[PDB]
Design a protein around this ligand. Structure first.
Ligand SMILES: CCCCCCCCCCCCCCCCCC(=O)OC[C@H](COP(=O)([O-])OCC(O)COP(=O)([O-])OC[C@@H](COC(=O)CCCCCCCCCCCCCCCCC)OC(=O)CCCCCCCCCCCCCCCCC)OC(=O)CCCCCCCCCCCCCCCCC
Ligand SMILES: CCCCCCCCCCCCCCCCCC(=O)O[C@@H](COC(=O)CCCCCCCCCCCCCCC)COP(=O)(O)OCC[N+](C)(C)C
Ligand SMILES: CCCCCCCCCCCCCCCCCCCC(=O)O[C@H](COC(=O)CCCCCCCCCCCCCC)COP(=O)(O)OCCN
Ligand SMILES: NC(=O)C1=CN([C@@H]2O[C@H](COP(=O)(O)OP(=O)(O)OC[C@H]3O[C@@H](n4cnc5c(N)ncnc54)[C@H](OP(=O)(O)O)[C@@H]3O)[C@@H](O)[C@H]2O)C=CC1
Ligand SMILES: COC1=C(OC)C(=O)C(C/C=C(\C)CC/C=C(\C)CC/C=C(\C)CC/C=C(\C)CCC=C(C)C)=C(C)C1=O
Ligand code: SF4
Ligand code: SF4
Ligand code: SF4
Lengths: 286, 216, 67, 199, 157, 31, 383, 363
């Protein structure tokens, strides 16, 4: 029954990832006064499936100067971690569920760094360290935000936890600036605009590349569900769609930062703000 | 560094009467009288700045090109601060077949001037890199295209042609299509240079009238 | 030769040849905008934010006592 | 707005200069220091809580709900004019005789040398071509050949959709150019009925 | 036998529908013709509507669009980037310069056609071709992809 | 705020091949 | 310590750059060019003067008629040819349409290199409208070959000024909605403010021109100091900034689009009736009806389309305020129907030479901003 | 006929735009050897006609090899149909056969490809009257008394070709090395990517490998010399090697420090390869199946494959064949070594190198 529940979870995750990448193309097109994919299937509804099948019959490039095992292992590790994080969202009852998902998302750094070590490109090694530095820098603000969230999460028996079923079903109006910081931290983790300067998958083709992008979009959906649980009073389909629309909307209208600019932002703005909010919420919670 | 924005109103005028009269009429005689050893020949002709005026052309030796250009940059009446280009023209009938040409612009008094040096293939021309910073790439291009050596240049190397390219393409005796051509070889797995072959050779049309009077 | 092209039957002078070209309308075109044309006070924004956050903190206190 | 701030400076020499000296207060393009409480709250609501990102977001959301400028090719087309320079073609008189008389003016004016012509006299004494080639991969589509022709024999027609799979399909000889003219003759004549007022 | 051959033919149909509807080209914006290729990707013609995504790396690229003149200095770099694309791949030559040298055909510095360096599937004529003409050429390349029968050829080997 | 994309007959009402008034172009001076 | 420089190769895929870094800070930049050098200066010696004219469309292929202008003016000065009034007005009007096209592409490609994708897609539909204006008068969307010696090639078709006025009536709104995404945005400012600063002495010492020169506090516009055609009649302002910034160049370029709109509106109302070509039949070809009815016109048509006019022996340099700066042609005439030597001066060649002194002290993510703000096209750089 | 083939229509010095006068039909032109032969003919200004069975994507690389109009491409070739063979050779004075097979399939057997098609090709070539030369490719180990089926069917087809077309040349090269070969590539796929590599017996059978460019030059040298019509030539390199020596050379070149090969008796190797040989029919042919995983390879490994004494070889064609073990031929296998090819420390020789070079290479 656990294997059945996990496969029944896995099916809409992949279907949703295909529909997310189509919806990103089409919403980005509608903001730019065009159409986006319409030809490939009726209303363009077959475009992600033909992208996946095109990459399926695409030639796998295995460079004969790299280490083949780590090269194969990097997108597998990314994909596996995304699927495991989704299972932790929906098929768990653990006491420290948010800490579990934070631990899983801290493991997601390895696919980037294994891709940087494996492929023998000069600037893949240069960009992997930058991407890892960005993700590493914003993980701390995510953790301090979780500290602020957990100060008010108590179940019926009186025990404090990070269990998702014990979270309240009303929006957390008291933590609006922390919610905004959380959303920009999600944007920084997924390497989206305005942090998309670093790429690391420059040597990958066919289904290894497809695994990289499925992992990226599934991680975006994980973080969207986490933000909707923590701040928006629950996990729902409408909230997932609205937050995804917001992320595409921000990608349509903004330019990106330099490397040192978002490093200064994450180490001089977001971390002191989350720590100061934690101290204020701890003072309130007494 | 001149022509700073000073008037906040719309200006309906170009230059002043006295300085424009001096630049358009007296500048050739002025340059000849003040620095006579620098000037060997002068032409006053149809005016780079506008169709309505006349402007001078100064011929000088290579031994005095740098002091003449420093004088033309820094003298209070001739403030030629901008060097627009350096180029060459090939005259194969002459003993010295090359004319190196320098164009200058004066933002202070809305003027322009042209400076020429005549050399052959084996006489070096002093560089103007210390006088004008744009002289670097233009001298590199002139060496690339014509084979004029500029002594004292920091790094005189070719800038425009192919990596192994010997030969100076803008000479009159260099062929238009060249000597070598390029293709991919499946056996050597490399892009390879081969002697030139043309599927259709270039057709030269000799149009020139035997009554025409203007040919010089 | 130009009389063969633009001239009309019974034309007396070469100065009477018609001209019909692309022209602005009589009076010209109307004028257009050329230059650039262009929020709430920060006190108002901070007041609304403080009101929302104060309501949130009151609800947090109430749910804490119920728990 | 185009105003500057100490801190929003993109470089390091100016960042070091603004935090160690007050030379930026002389410059009129800088935003001045707030003087009272309300100005401090306005500056903080500018820096924190964004509100400059939000104006661009409101504009792009307005564009999301606006009209689109995409045409559905090949069911819908763009807009062109009778002067449009497309695929070259050779023309006839209404009787069916060729207009071309092998004057070799279009071959002389062609800056790409994309035209190759040979001629002799026909069996009825007429002056006609025996070869008229146009290398379409050498052509630059200038229209100078159309200008040089004194009998309106060579034209650039209104066709732009003539991509092929082999390059040998783009070395046109005389027969294919006459076939193009026989295909496009009515459209070419309609275009030339307007463009003869100007040329 | 009849059923398995019918299934194999439908596998070719689905694979060709996928490959033609997911062409990811690589941009060589060498010259003039690149601006018309930018106009093809813009909002009026919308190359993204047909499933076309421009990719920066050759490893994710399905096609190459040579849009501009090719010089002797640029030919080995173009060949090297072509060799790094994985199979199956196509080449679209755009404009007179890439087609046959064009206006620079008799120059000492120009390759007379990109045919001389890489093999080419679809030639688009013009100097420049219009963006709509480039759409016509890309739809023709899609038609060439539709006539392929890969698993039927493999089944009868 | 002037709108992009004018509607029917508000822009390019006549095609250039169907000019509503015949054109008489001077090619020589009367002098 | 004794820190050696780390070097980097930046793109075969047509600018090649060899950088040196001392960490995250660049110490040197060396551009390697010639990947688009097609030898057009050699090929122009083998063409007649009319034959070599479409070479100039393919130098700065974002701004075509402005490249044609300087070659035509250089020929006209040596020929002593006067252009009629209507042709001068048409040349000014299409030169300003060309400047608007170039500035739209330059600003939006710069903002796309920085990371903002929407202004590109917004401005290219306006570019499509101005391409339709090119096509309706020349039959080509880009390489028009419209400007000729002594005037323009064809007259304006009936109905063009009506549509140019209808575009100009809404272009200010388009430029306004363009600036709402970029001008008051902190990310764009933090990318552009104080990046790649050019002072006036360095601008004149490095041969700068165009909107670079105006952003360093220099009042120098060739359309106001050395005017050509009917630019002296035009009433417009020169925008001036004083930091030498990327941000200041962006603001100057937007204001120059406003001023080009002003000149376009003035040309739409003062367009005269008359000749658009010079009446010298020994330079300008006759009309097609005249050629088919008079013997002298047919002789002049035959000779002008084969041998061409003979330019008298001499030399000149003529320059135009092209939308990237000063574009100039040095024409050397021996007396024949072919140019003896035709040197082409491009502003982007001089602007790209400055990347060694402009990128010093900057980071890797600011190189693309510097390259974008210099407004370079490698057709005119690599002739 | 004699040397009028190479002289009578030769126009131009011999580059891409010149004319050699040869119209050639190459069967199997998209293959390993056929592509090099088609490149060798077309670069000298010959018209080459290439029929093929595969998809056009696998034949597109032949389009580049010659000038406009000189590479002719004919898809959907069916060699059981005489109309396709008749159309493909209808203008050619030279026919070159590179069609061969290594594994059997439910649609194609060794006799269909090595016997029936060469016989019908030689007959249709002799019917035209304008074909002056027929170059048929077979193997160095071809023998009618061979236990391996492919060698026997190859020798039988050689006999049929020399019967039906009496002036046809039979070419029998050894193992051919190249970037896309079937000799080092499968041996490297056997040294790596497998738990163990079986070696038949002691690995003391002798072979004479040769380079693909030398075979391509040999075809043109055959077309020059009129005496070589009707003969049989053996093409082998300047070194005779055993399979153990070849394995040792590959292990030294790849820089592998663990010999994963094991020497096995021939019955054990045949017992391993037997289950995937009784099922080779009723199957359309599978990807990534080695041609060394058959009993025919085991029978070939029990014999020598060298040039016979007194035979005509490279020296009679004026060709000194290149070495196979070192030089340009061994460079592709040097790219598959552990870590990468790479240069080295590069600092002993950078001592008196100029200034900008060391900083450019960051030495
Ligand atoms: C946070 C990070 C992210 C991870 C979390 C994500 C969640 C899990 C996702 C799963 C991962 C996806 C992709 C998997 C990779 C697939 C394999 C691959 O590509 O090749 C690997 C490949 C092998 O290296 P190579 O490139 O071929 O050679 C380069 C070296 O220089 C060559 O080095 P070498 O030659 O020196 O090493 C040789 C070695 C090579 O090792 C490997 O092959 C890698 C080993 C781990 C890979 C596991 C993947 C599957 C392998 C089969 C597992 C079978 C185990 C049993 C299962 C039941 C089956 C019957 O093989 C051996 O000979 C091993 C010798 C054993 C020890 C001897 C010392 C003791 C002697 C005492 C007496 C002996 C008795 O590279 C890696 O090892 C990549 C590491 C990444 C793997 C994931 C890390 C986490 C694994 C899961 C969590 C651990 C929980 C424990 C549970 C069971 C253990 C696994
Ligand atoms: C390490 C190597 C793999 C070891 C796999 C293993 O131990 O298999 C497990 C786990 O593996 C699986 O069952 C899944 C097999 C993976 C492949 C499935 C592909 C998707 C369909 C067996 O599970 P069961 O004992 O049948 O399940 C117990 C009951 N309960 C459902 C409640 C968990
Ligand atoms: C859906 C996706 C939502 C996000 C869309 C927009 C993405 C914007 C990304 C870039 C944001 C820039 C940014 O965060 O700038 C910082 C200011 O803003 C912030 O720090 C913003 C986050 C914090 C919100 C405000 C927190 C305080 C509010 C009041 C708290 C006290 C009263 C209530 C208890 C620092 O930029 P800077 O210029 O300030 O840096 C000072 C040194 N240069
Ligand atoms: N070392 C070696 O490789 C040696 C090779 N030879 C001979 O030289 C020739 C070239 O060999 P090589 O290029 O290495 O091998 P390849 O497999 O690369 O070439 C064989 C060619 O024949 C075609 N072909 C095979 N079967 C059929 C069929 N039933 N119908 C139509 N076409 C077919 C193949 O086309 P497709 O791509 O469609 O399969 C392929 O192009 C071979 O015939 C071989 O016998 C001789 C001695 C040594
Ligand atoms: C601008 O952003 C974007 C990109 O740049 C970042 C992109 O690269 C892509 C293109 C890449 C894509 C779509 C690859 C990632 C997605 C995949 C592979 C889809 C996953 C879907 C699955 C597993 C379900 C499909 C399978 C089915 C239904 C099974 C079929 C089985 C049978 C018929 C038996 C897109 C669309 C995009 O927008
Ligand atoms: S349009 Fe131009 S390139 Fe084409 S044939 Fe005519 S003159 Fe030659
Ligand atoms: S097409 Fe016209 S110009 Fe050309 S040869 Fe014929 S008649 Fe003369
Ligand atoms: S074909 Fe014409 S438009 Fe295209 S790059 Fe060449 S010159 Fe420019």
């Amino acid at each position: 029954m656990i294997v059945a529940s996990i496969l029944i979870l896995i099916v809409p995750v992949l279907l949703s990832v295909a529909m997310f990448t189509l919806a990103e193309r089409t919403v980005m097109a509608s903001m730019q006064r065009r159409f986006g994919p319409q030809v490939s299937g009726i209303s363009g509804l077959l475009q992600p499936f033909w992208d996946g099948l095109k990459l399926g019959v695409k030639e796998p490039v295995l460079p004969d100067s790299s280490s083949a095992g780590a090269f194969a292992a990097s997108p597998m590790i990314s994909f596996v971690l995304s699927q495991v994080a989704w299972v932790g969202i929906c098929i768990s009852d653990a006491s420290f569920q948010g800490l579990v998902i934070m631990a899983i998302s801290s493991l997601a750094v390895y696919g980037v760094m294994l891709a940087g070590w494996a492929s023998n490109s000069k600037y893949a090694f240069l960009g992997c360290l930058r991407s890892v530095a960005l993700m590493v820098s914003y993980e701390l603000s995510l953790g301090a935000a979780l500290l602020s969230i957990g100060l008010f999460v108590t179940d019926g028996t009186g025990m404090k936890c990070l269990n998702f079923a014990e979270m309240p079903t009303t929006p957390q109006y008291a933590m609006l600036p922390l919610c905004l910081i959380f959303l920009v931290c999600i944007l920084a983790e997924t390497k989206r605009d305005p942090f998309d300067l670093p790429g690391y998958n420059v040597e990958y083709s066919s289904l290894g590349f497809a695994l990289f992008f499925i992992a990226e979009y599934a991680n975006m959906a994980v973080m969207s569900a986490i933000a909707s649980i923590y701040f928006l009073g629950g996990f729902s389909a409408l909230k997932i769609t609205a937050l995804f629309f917001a992320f595409v909307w921000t990608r349509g209208t903004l330019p990106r930062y330099r490397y040192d600019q978002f490093m200064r932002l994450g180490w001089k703005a977001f971390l002191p703000l989350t720590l100061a909010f934690f101290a204020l919420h701890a003072s309130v919670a007494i | 560094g001149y022509a700073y924005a000073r008037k906040t109103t719309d200006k309906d005028y170009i230059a002043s009467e006295h300085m424009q009269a001096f630049g358009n009429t007296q500048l050739t005689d002025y340059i000849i009288k003040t620095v006579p050893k620098f000037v060997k020949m002068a032409v006053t002709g149809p005016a780079q700045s506008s169709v309505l005026y006349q402007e001078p052309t100064i011929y000088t030796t290579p031994e005095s090109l740098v002091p003449l250009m420093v004088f033309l940059r820094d003298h209070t009446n001739t403030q030629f601060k901008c060097l627009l280009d350096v180029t060459a023209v090939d005259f194969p009938e002459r003993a010295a077949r090359f004319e190196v040409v320098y164009h200058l612009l004066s933002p202070r008094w809305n003027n322009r001037i042209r400076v020429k040096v005549c050399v052959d293939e084996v006489t070096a021309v002093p560089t103007l890199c210390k006088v004008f910073n744009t002289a670097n790439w233009f001298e590199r291009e002139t060496w690339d295209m014509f084979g004029v050596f500029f002594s004292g240049h920091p790094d005189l190397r070719r800038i425009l042609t192919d990596y192994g390219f010997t030969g100076h393409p803008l000479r009159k005796d260099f062929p238009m299509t060249g000597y070598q051509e390029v293709r991919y070889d499946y056996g050597k797995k490399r892009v390879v240079s081969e002697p030139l072959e043309l599927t259709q050779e270039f057709r030269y049309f000799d149009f020139n009238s035997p009554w025409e009077t203007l040919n010089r | 030769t130009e009389v063969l092209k633009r001239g009309f039957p019974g034309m007396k002078s070469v100065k009477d040849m018609p001209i019909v070209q692309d022209a602005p309308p009589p009076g010209g075109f109307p004028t257009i905008r050329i230059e650039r044309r262009l929020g709430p006070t920060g006190v108002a924004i901070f007041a609304g934010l403080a009101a929302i956050m104060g309501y949130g903190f009151y609800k947090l206190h109430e749910q804490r006592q119920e728990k | 707005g185009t105003e500057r701030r100490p801190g929003e400076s993109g470089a390091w020499k100016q960042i070091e200069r603004q935090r160690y000296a007050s030379d930026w207060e002389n410059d009129p393009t800088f935003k001045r220091t707030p003087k009272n409480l309300a100005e401090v709250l306005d500056d903080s609501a500018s820096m924190l809580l964004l509100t400059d990102v939000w104006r661009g977001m409101a504009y792009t959301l307005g564009a999301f709900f606006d009209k689109k400028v995409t045409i559905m090719y090949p069911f819908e087309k763009g807009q062109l004019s009778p002067r449009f320079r497309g695929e070259h073609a050779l023309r006839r008189y209404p009787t069916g005789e060729e207009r071309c008389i092998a004057c070799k003016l279009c071959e002389a004016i062609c800056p790409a040398q994309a035209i190759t012509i040979e001629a002799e006299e026909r069996e009825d004494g007429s002056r006609r071509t025996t070869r008229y080639d146009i290398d379409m991969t050498k052509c630059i589509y200038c229209g100078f050949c159309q200008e040089a022709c004194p009998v309106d024999a060579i034209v650039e027609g209104p066709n732009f959709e003539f991509s092929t799979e082999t390059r040998e399909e783009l070395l046109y000889d005389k027969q294919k150019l006459l076939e193009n003219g026989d295909k496009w003759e009515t459209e070419i004549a309609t275009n030339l009925r307007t463009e003869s007022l100007y040329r | 036998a009849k059923g398995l051959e019918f299934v194999v033919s439908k596998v070719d149909n689905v694979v060709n529908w996928a490959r033609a509807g997911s062409i990811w080209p690589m941009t060589f914006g060498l010259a003039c013709c690149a601006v018309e290729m930018m106009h093809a990707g813009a909002s009026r013609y919308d190359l993204d509507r047909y499933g076309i995504i421009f990719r920066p790396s050759p490893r994710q690229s399905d096609a190459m669009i040579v849009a501009g003149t090719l010089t002797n200095k640029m030919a080995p770099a173009l060949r090297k980037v072509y060799d790094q694309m994985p199979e199956p791949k196509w080449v679209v030559s755009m404009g007179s310069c890439a087609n046959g040298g064009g206006y620079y055909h008799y120059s000492y510095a120009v390759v007379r056609g990109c045919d001389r360096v890489v093999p080419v599937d679809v030639y688009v004529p013009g100097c420049p071709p219009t963006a709509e003409g480039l759409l016509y050429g890309l739809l023709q390349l899609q038609k060439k992809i539709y006539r392929s029968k890969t698993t039927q050829i493999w089944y009868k080997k | 705020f002037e709108h992009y994309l004018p509607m029917g007959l508000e822009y390019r009402k006549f095609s250039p091949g169907t000019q509503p008034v015949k054109a008489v172009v001077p090619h020589d001076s009367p002098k | 310590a004794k820190v050696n420089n780390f070097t980097l190769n930046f793109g075969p895929q047509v600018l090649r750059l060899v950088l040196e870094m001392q960490g995250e800070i660049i110490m040197r930049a060396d551009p390697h060019i010639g990947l688009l050098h097609r030898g057009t200066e050699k090929l122009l010696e083998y063409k007649t003067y009319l034959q070599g004219l479409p070479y100039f469309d393919r130098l700065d292929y974002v701004s075509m008629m402005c490249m044609e202008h300087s070659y035509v003016l250089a020929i006209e000065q040596l020929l002593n040819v006067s252009v009629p009034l209507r042709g001068q007005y048409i040349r000014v009007l299409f030169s300003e349409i060309t400047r608007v096209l170039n500035h739209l592409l330059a600003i939006t490609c710069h903002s796309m290199d920085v990371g903002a994708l929407t202004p590109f897609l917004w401005a290219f539909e306006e570019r499509e409208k101005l391409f339709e204006f090119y096509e309706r008068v020349s039959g080509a969307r880009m390489h028009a070959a419209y400007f000729r010696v002594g005037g323009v090639s064809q007259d304006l078709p009936i109905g063009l000024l009506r549509d140019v006025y209808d575009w100009a009536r809404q272009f200010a709104s388009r430029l306004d909605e363009m600036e709402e995404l970029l001008t008051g945005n902190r990310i764009w400012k933090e990318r552009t403010v104080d990046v790649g600063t050019i002072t006036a002495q360095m601008a004149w010492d490095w041969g700068c021109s165009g909107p670079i020169l105006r952003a360093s506090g220099i009042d120098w516009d060739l359309r106001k100091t050395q005017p050509y055609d009917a630019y002296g009649k035009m009433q417009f302002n020169v925008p001036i900034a004083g930091h030498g910034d990327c941000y200041d160049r962006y603001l100057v370029r937007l204001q120059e689009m406003r001023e080009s709109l002003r000149i376009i509106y003035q040309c739409l109302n003062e367009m005269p009736d008359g000749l658009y070509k010079s009446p010298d039949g020994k330079v300008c070809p006759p009309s097609r009806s005249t050629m088919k009815q008079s013997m002298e016109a047919l002789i002049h048509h035959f000779k002008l389309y084969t041998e061409g006019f003979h330019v008298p022996a001499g030399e000149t340099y003529r320059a135009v305020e092209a939308p990237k700066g000063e574009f100039g042609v040095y024409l050397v005439s021996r007396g024949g129907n072919r140019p003896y030597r035709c040197k082409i001066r491009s502003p982007g060649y001089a602007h790209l030479q400055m990347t060694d002194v402009i990128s010093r002290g900057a980071m890797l993510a600011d190189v693309v901003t510097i390259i974008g703000t210099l407004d370079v096209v490698f057709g005119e750089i690599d002739r | 006929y004699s040397s009028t083939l190479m002289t009578a229509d030769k126009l131009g010095p011999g580059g891409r735009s010149s004319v050699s006068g040869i119209t050639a039909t190459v069967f199997g032109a998209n293959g390993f050897l056929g592509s090099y032969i088609v490149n060798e003919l077309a670069k000298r200004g010959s018209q080459v006609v290439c029929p093929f069975r595969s998809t056009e994507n696998e034949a597109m690389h032949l389009k580049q090899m010659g000038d406009l109009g000189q590479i002719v491409l004919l898809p959907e070739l069916d060699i059981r149909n005489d109309d396709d063979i008749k159309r493909a050779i209808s203008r050619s004075n030279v026919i070159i056969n590179c069609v061969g097979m290594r594994l059997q399939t439910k649609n194609w057997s060794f006799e269909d490809v090595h016997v029936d098609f060469p016989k019908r090709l030689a007959k249709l070539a002799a019917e035209t009257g304008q074909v002056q030369r027929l170059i048929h490719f077979s193997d160095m180990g071809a023998d009618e008394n061979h236990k391996s089926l492919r060698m026997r069917t190859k020798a039988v087809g050689d006999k049929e070709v020399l019967d039906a077309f009496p002036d046809a040349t039979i070419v029998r090269p050894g193992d051919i090395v190249g970037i896309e070969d079937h000799f080092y590539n499968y041996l490297i796929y056997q040294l790596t990517l497998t738990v163990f590599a079986p070696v038949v017996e002691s690995g003391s059978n002798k072979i004479q490998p040769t380079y693909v460019l030398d075979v391509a030059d040999a075809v043109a040298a055959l077309l020059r010399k009129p005496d070589t019509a009707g003969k049989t030539l053996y093409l082998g390199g300047p070194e005779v090697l055993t399979m153990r020596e070849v394995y040792d050379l590959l292990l030294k070149t790849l820089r592998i420090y663990r010999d994963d090969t094991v020497h096995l008796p021939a019955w054990a190797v045949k017992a391993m390869y037997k289950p995937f040989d009784s099922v080779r029919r009723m199957l359309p042919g599978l990807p990534m199946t080695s041609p060394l995983a058959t009993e025919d390879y085991v029978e070939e490994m029990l014999r020598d494959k060298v040039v016979p004494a007194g035979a005509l070889g490279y020296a009679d064609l004026g060709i000194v064949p290149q070495k196979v073990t070192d030089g340009l031929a061994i460079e592709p296998v040097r790219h598959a070594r552990v870590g990468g090819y790479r240069w080295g420390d590069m600092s002993a020789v950078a001592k008196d190198i100029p200034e900008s070079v060391r900083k450019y290479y960051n030495i």
